[PDB]
Amino acid sequence: DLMIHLQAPDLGSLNSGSLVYFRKIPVGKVYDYAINPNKQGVVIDVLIERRFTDLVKKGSRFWNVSGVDANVSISGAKVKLESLAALVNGAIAFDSPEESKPAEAEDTFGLYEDLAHSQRGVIIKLELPSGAGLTADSTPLMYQGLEVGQLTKLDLNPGGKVTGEMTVDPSVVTLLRENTRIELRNPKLSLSDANLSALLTGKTFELVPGDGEPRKEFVVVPGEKALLHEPDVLTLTLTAPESYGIDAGQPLILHGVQVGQVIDRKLTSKGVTFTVAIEPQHRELVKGDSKFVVNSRVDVKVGLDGVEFLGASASEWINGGIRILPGDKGEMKASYPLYANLEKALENSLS
Template identity: 30%
Template sequence: MSPDTTPPPPEVDPAPRVAPDPPSARTERSRWPGWIWGIPVAAVAIVAWLAFKEISATGPKVTVIFPGAQGISANQTEVQYQGLKVGEVESVRLEKDLLHVRAQIRMSSEMDGHLGPGTMFWISGPNLSNLSSIRSIISGPTIGIEPRPGGTQNQYEGLARPPVISEPVPGRHYVLRAKDPGSVAPGSQIYFRSHDVGTVESVTLTADRTFTIAAFVRSPYEQLVHEGTRFWNAGAVQVSLDAGGPRVQLQSLPALLGGAVDFETPSGLADGPAAAEGTAFTLYTSKDEAEYAPGAQAVSYQVVFGPEAGGLQKGASVRLAGQRVGSVIDSRLVFDRASGALREQVTMGIEPWRIALSGGATWSGTGRGEMDALMRQLIKDGLRAQPGSSIPLVGPSDVELAFVNGAKPATLIAGNPPEIPTAPGGAGLDGIMNAVSGIAGKLDRLPIDQIAGNMRTLTDRLAALSESPKLTRGLDSLQQSLANLEQVSASAKTEVPALLVSLRKVASQADRTVADARQLISTTAGNGPIGTNTAGLGQTLYELSRAAESMRELADYLTRHPSALIRGRS
């Protein structure tokens, strides 16, 4: 039998056991939320930052009313200050009056605090005087701004053109008056001998249909402006015609494009004090007009011409002994009912300082008394007023105060102003024809044919007396002179200009002929009488000498006074 493999019975614990409590769960909160929430938080932060940056970078929004759109558009037209962008147009709309436009402009933050009262906005388009603005032809206009300190205003009035900003330097303001400003405009430069010294601030049309121009001259150049200073429009090409021929003056490119004003003070008026603030001056159209226009010191006179004067214009020159001493102030046609004739009444101004006094003396006061005394003396010596021209035919008409040989006694005629007596004369084609006819008539009346006949008889007799070379040369010279005289006499009626050209040559030849003939007479005087029919020899030589003298006098006069072909010679 196998051993007993039955397991023993289990042991029984006398004391029953209690099961332990199950373990409890413990939770711990994380210090950070889940990573998924980081994305929206980051997005919110970025948006907030961008919004803050945009708000801080954007300046105030302003409203500007312009008189016209002139090409400005929303989201394209910039506001610029000193060449930098400081704003942009956000919207543009037409006002109810259909004349103005309202522009909403967003300014940059840098302009905050600089948009106070007085701030100016303007539309800046292409301007030939400002070459840098020409690029606006392609990119469109911009809006300029001149800031002023202070808070932002609700609305601003825009300008159609750039204003003239006051110079930040000392100087003086003057007023220029003109009937027509020409090319002068706000912003035009003011020059003194091609040097920039100031600016035109404004040009205003007044009720009397003239223009008032506000001019500013910087310091220290205001010391160059005196009471007698002359201003003129220097922005155009100046063309003039005088005795020296045609003259053309070209200005600088900025002056031609943007207009300019120039000024100068006559030498006789530059010693006075500088002109005060606000002094008014006349703006002349050209340098010549400004230089010769009668000033406050001019002494006025009048002359009365016939209608042949040719219509003297205001500003025409008044010349004394060939030098310009004044200008015509007024000229008008007057009908004299007593005589039934037309007259041209001319008022002219003569400036005493243009006539120097001997011994270093100067004109005193207004110069009226001294100038009247001078005129009385000159008129007593034969001074008369005549219509003339600086250039025959093509030159402008003027007044010439010249001495007339054989003038009838006259004096300064009392009046307001006093009247200077005139001498007969003419201008234009009628005057030329009368003068030429008079010269031809005088030459026709010369006994040239008689002198030639007598001289030919004389030469024939002298040739029979001697065959010496010296006498032969003298006779040849005499024969040549006679041939010239006969040719001149034959052509005098049809070729007066050619006759005038040959006057001096004929006179010289005639003089040599007389000298040779007299020498021949002296040489043969000791050899007995030249002939039996020589009673007229002395008279013939005398007539020839007088003819030569007349020709020379006429040639000399025409050389000194070429305008005598216009006026005739008294």
């Protein structure tokens, strides 16, 4: 027979004589349990039978299937009572990997508390902004709409630095590399597609791939800042003597289509300095010369023969933001002015 040791943080629902399963086949039993010399953890030593000594490998993971948990899920709760023998007395199930040396001679093993905690994969360290809607073992990493990861740990390091970590499955592991971003998506209010499921999920880590050297630690920024952190982004610091009602997250518009987003608005003594970012599409477009016209304010002028509306439309007004007047050739200097309307941009009159 084989006599191996398990290290658990507590005994759980396991009694002496409780049963050990492989593929839900009883292939052994729990022999004894004892507190190890330090009071910290409980060592449970089990006895795999003589026939099944070749099942237990060095790379095996043992997990605890004892009691029953009833999990209510959104849009219906499927609670299935699979195994009746585990409720009364407790059980330990285990997996056998493909290629590992067979274990022997009282080899220790960590005892995971659940099947979900004993999933294989790669630990990925994250430096989170805040843990406001993030949860331990409930926040997924989506990729192409599929669940790829699971936030497994969430800590508040000293200095007020929330960091967590994530198990991803091996498939995607080759996708993670340099300039590969993980940004958290808010469950944003969708008018065209009504999805209550997404609304109930909450915060959601989105993986967007890049190329380069494989890395294993990332920095998650807020969703607005994500554009700024993209690999090929162009960042213009544009000044203005007034905010003109332009918030931090207004869209930035060329020829009617959004080419960029405002990132942040900083108030100084000289005026209001914006920092806007630009997707690659308008990166090629700029050519070093442009004018920047506010779309946040409506303007109507009354006249006998002259009737004009300047700088806005009602839909434009709800979106707001900054309009681009592209030029032919320039050098992409550091600072640009923000003109109050279109005709002061044609007059080149920043006053």
